[PDB]
Design a protein around this ligand. Structure first.
Ligand SMILES: [Mg+2]
Ligand SMILES: [Mg+2]
Ligand SMILES: [Mg+2]
Ligand SMILES: [Mg+2]
Ligand SMILES: [Mg+2]
Ligand SMILES: [Mg+2]
Ligand SMILES: [Mg+2]
Ligand SMILES: [Mg+2]
Ligand SMILES: [Mg+2]
Ligand SMILES: [Mg+2]
Ligand SMILES: [Mg+2]
Ligand SMILES: [Mg+2]
Ligand SMILES: [Mg+2]
Ligand SMILES: [Mg+2]
Ligand SMILES: [Mg+2]
Ligand SMILES: [Mg+2]
Ligand SMILES: [Mg+2]
Ligand SMILES: [Mg+2]
Ligand SMILES: [Mg+2]
Ligand SMILES: [Mg+2]
Lengths: 203, 147, 210, 102
RNA sequence: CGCGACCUCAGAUCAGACGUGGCGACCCGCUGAAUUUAAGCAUAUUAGUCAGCGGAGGAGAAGAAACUAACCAGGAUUCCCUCAGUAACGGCGAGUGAACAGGGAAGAGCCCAGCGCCGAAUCCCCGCCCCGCGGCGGGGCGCGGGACAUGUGGCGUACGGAA
RNA sequence: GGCCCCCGGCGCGCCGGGCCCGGGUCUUCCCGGAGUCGGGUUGCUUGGGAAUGCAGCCCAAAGCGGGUGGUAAACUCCAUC
């Protein structure tokens, strides 16, 4: 089936074909606003593996994000404090750019419920992304049982809480020895557990 | 029981048992184990010889259960079994010798402290001492390795 | 400041711990709540064991625990396959099934098949309607018990096989255990180099020809 | 002469009979399928090769094959990936050489 | 020099929907000190703690192994007891500091993309009738619109699956 | 203990629809998520120590592959996802 071809082609990103296209796409995207609703998914394939479905009430915003790290917002330098914390230039945000991308798509379209995102290119200055969104109150989603989990109000603002695939990754949770921080729910919760004087009745 | 404590008997007296030349100030030494090298050194190196310094090899992902090997002495090996195995034996007249599975009772190694009574055995165990073996043989028994 | 002899001891009360003290005044109230909730769940699953489903027998890991045996999480697929219970159905008759369990040795497998067989013997499957089709048991074994089973269903008891008094053949007596262990240690230690020197010597014998 | 099972040394541990079950289906992942192979190489004649790959082919042609690997390791990352790539490149280069000779 | 497809884009007080603020004990994501300790202090510590911003729910988060182990092996997540003030970190000073096993509380497991087969077999909105209507649903009937082949629905997902 | 309201929850009947929904045995086919993994790096973070986890930047994959197997690397068997 064509999707497997498309998939394998897109892995040849250093190839002559895909490099040509990526350059032309990235030029084109750069010549638009920072947030615009793509009429259809640039990457159909990827979108399907991430859970897009080509029916009504699935949406896709292409969102630009400025690239590079995070300089410490303090006037001049003047991070007054112990010279551990004197750093301002070479320091780096916890979440990814892709998460930031989703978060912004989420912010803008409050009714819409961020499902998942994928990449469409990168300049020196910008990255580009494509956030799949969903109306939780369009009948075609509501009545389809397999999606109607997103219409539940626990799934409000997934991206804001660190719950999309992208913003999950910063949280630092997976099974096995390479984690332990996040061995309750999350990073914060384990610390909480580990720094509770459990003070029993009888002692 | 505050009733019994010392502050009840100190009521009335000025200094509260802390003296009046020197007082009860907050932290005159430094907090805690401060000064281990300087200014508390003598206490450290006459009641904790060897506090300071590294020694030996690091071992990163220590898991204690690998090195699990609870020992038992010949001293009290017969304790593992009901008296009537040690009694139906020194009797019987077959020269039978009853088995003692030490690993069942929760000891892996059998070390050799103590006098073993002149009364044959078959000791099943994961590990043995040299002496524990020897004593067992001298009783007229047989050590038996188990996985 | 330390004064004459004592453990040079490190307490961990430097963070704001009184902000995170966790009292246990619940616990009685808790213990009850669980207990009510427990009795409710029994009553809901009416003649079904209060326990839960049946669970496999399983040995612990590590040299330490090794000798003991617990209840496992669920019966493997091979064990269901050999017993002849369709895995999707086994859930519906109160048989725990995990499918992530390997099955290394055949001693642990046949035991766990035996478990399921025994379960299926002493199980009282009620028919779907009061009108009785196949599988569903007789109204005798139904009226005589729509009874719950208190406690864990067919409990595992870690058990020992009594060894009778032998005679000690002149061979057991001959054995030198401690030595044997020392030897067995050194051969694991030295296996690998010995093989490298032999590989060296073999190369020297072949090199002599050419 | 009496071979008690031991808890320590080479053929150690509790002696138990082994069943030889069907290996889990999870274990066969990454096995190259006839149809996937066809797709993979169907695309290597559309898309062609990357720049670093091409540069390595040119090294391999010259028979300077250590420098080829030194390059691929710095480029790809590991040794084992670099070595596996160098074999593919040498295979490609050979099938060109066979194709030319006709 | 028109008319017609589509593509990409606009504008509507267009028809019908949703989002905005609050609360914040508990919860998720960021951000993030300095008093303080070290008898001084800069790494360390205080602390991923206070303050700061964001977003929730009746709980949240987590969760059905790219896991543990190295055993005769265990088998999602969470919680307690233990592991253990231990392995480890550390001007190896002050200080800091987990995990597996073991025993419990509870216990529940599943679905896509893909790969394939099936006349798109699917969905939304209109309009007419019968029931039902204070959580807008059922059934029928319309050459009544649209979405959709740049892929909807049934079967199926590694515990194998299809024919 | 009683009576009266209301509401819930479960039991039986009727109708309206939907719904022709198994298992084993042998054969022939089918099979996996990329700017991701991985590497280098710098900064934070961790008990995690020749890098526990998260980041930016650069490189940038494979398919008997990939990941893990708590000391860097090469060769090699195993185990485990
Ligand atoms: Mg500091
Ligand atoms: Mg990652
Ligand atoms: Mg005094
Ligand atoms: Mg005074
Ligand atoms: Mg004084
Ligand atoms: Mg229970
Ligand atoms: Mg709000
Ligand atoms: Mg100070
Ligand atoms: Mg001071
Ligand atoms: Mg000062
Ligand atoms: Mg800290
Ligand atoms: Mg706060
Ligand atoms: Mg939840
Ligand atoms: Mg997973
Ligand atoms: Mg666990
Ligand atoms: Mg202790
Ligand atoms: Mg700390
Ligand atoms: Mg499909
Ligand atoms: Mg730190
Ligand atoms: Mg090693």
């Amino acid at each position: 089936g064509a999707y497997k071809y498309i998939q394998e082609l897109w892995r040849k990103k250093q190839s002559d074909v895909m490099r040509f296209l990526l350059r032309v796409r990235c030029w084109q995207y750069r010549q638009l606003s920072a947030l615009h609703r793509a009429p259809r998914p640039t990457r159909p394939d990827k979108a399907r593996r991430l859970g897009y479905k080509a029916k009504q009430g699935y949406v896709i915003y292409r969102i630009r994000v400025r690239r590079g790290g995070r300089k410490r917002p303090v006037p001049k330098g003047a991070t007054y404090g112990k010279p551990v914390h004197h750093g301002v230039n070479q320091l780096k945000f916890a979440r990814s750019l892709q998460s930031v991308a989703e978060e912004r798509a989420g912010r803008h379209c409050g009714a819409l419920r961020v499902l998942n995102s994928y990449w469409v290119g990168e300049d020196s200055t910008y990255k580009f992304f494509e956030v799949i969104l969903i109306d939780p109150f369009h009948k075609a989603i509501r009545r389809n049982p397999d999606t109607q989990w997103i219409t539940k109000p626990v799934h409000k603002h997934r991206e804001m809480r660190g719950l999309t695939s992208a913003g999950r990754k910063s949280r630092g949770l997976g099974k096995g020895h390479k984690f332990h921080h996040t061995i309750g729910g999350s990073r914060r919760a384990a610390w909480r557990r580990r720094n509770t004087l459990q003070l029993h009745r009888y002692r | 029981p505050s009733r019994l404590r010392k502050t009840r008997k100190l009521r009335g007296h000025v200094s509260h048992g802390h003296g009046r030349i020197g007082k009860h100030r907050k932290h005159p030494g430094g907090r805690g184990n401060a000064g281990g090298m300087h200014h508390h050194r003598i206490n450290f190196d006459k009641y904790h010889p060897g506090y300071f310094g590294k020694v030996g090899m690091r071992h990163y992902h220590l898991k204690r259960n690998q090195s699990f090997c609870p020992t038992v002495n010949l001293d009290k090996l017969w304790t593992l079994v009901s008296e009537q195995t040690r009694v139906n034996a020194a009797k019987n007249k077959t020269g039978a010798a009853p088995i003692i599975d030490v690993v069942r009772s929760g000891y892996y190694k059998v070390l050799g402290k103590g006098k073993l009574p002149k009364q044959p055995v078959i000791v099943k165990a994961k590990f043995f001492s040299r002496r524990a073996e020897e004593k067992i043989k001298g009783v007229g028994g047989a050590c038996v390795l188990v996985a | 400041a330390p004064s004459r002899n004592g453990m040079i001891l490190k307490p961990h009360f430097h963070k704001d711990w009184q902000r995170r003290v966790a009292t246990w005044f619940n616990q009685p109230a808790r213990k009850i709540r669980r207990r009510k909730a427990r009795q409710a769940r029994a009553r809901r699953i009416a003649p079904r064991p209060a326990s839960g489903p049946l669970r496999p027998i399983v040995r612990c890991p590590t040299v330490r625990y090794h000798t003991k045996v617990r209840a496992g999480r669920g019966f493997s697929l091979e064990e269901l396959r050999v017993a002849g219970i369709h895995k999707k159905v086994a859930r519906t008759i109160g048989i725990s099934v995990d499918p992530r369990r390997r099955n290394k040795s055949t001693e642990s497998l046949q035991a766990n098949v035996q478990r399921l067989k025994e379960y299926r013997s002493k199980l009282v499957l009620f028919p779907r309607k009061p009108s009785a089709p196949k599988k569903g048991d007789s109204s005798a074994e139904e009226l005589k018990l729509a009874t719950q089973l208190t406690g864990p269903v067919m409990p595992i008891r870690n058990v020992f096989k009594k060894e009778k008094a032998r005679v000690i053949t002149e061979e057991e007596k001959n054995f030198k255990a401690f030595a044997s262990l020392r030897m067995a240690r050194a051969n694991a230690r030295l296996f690998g180099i010995r093989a490298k020197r032999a590989k060296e010597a073999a190369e020297q014998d072949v090199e002599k020809k050419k | 002469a009496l071979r008690y099972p031991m808890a320590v040394g080479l053929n150690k541990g509790h002696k138990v009979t082994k069943n030889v079950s069907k290996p889990r289906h999870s274990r066969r992942r990454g096995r190259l399928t006839k149809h996937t192979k066809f797709v993979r190489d169907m695309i290597r004649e559309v898309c062609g090769f990357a720049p670093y790959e091409r540069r390595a082919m040119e090294l391999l042609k010259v028979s300077k094959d250590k420098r080829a690997l030194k390059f691929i390791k710095k480029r790809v990352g590991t040794h084992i990936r670099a070595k596996r790539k160098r074999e593919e490149l040498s295979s490609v280069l050979a099938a060109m050489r066979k194709a030319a000779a006709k």
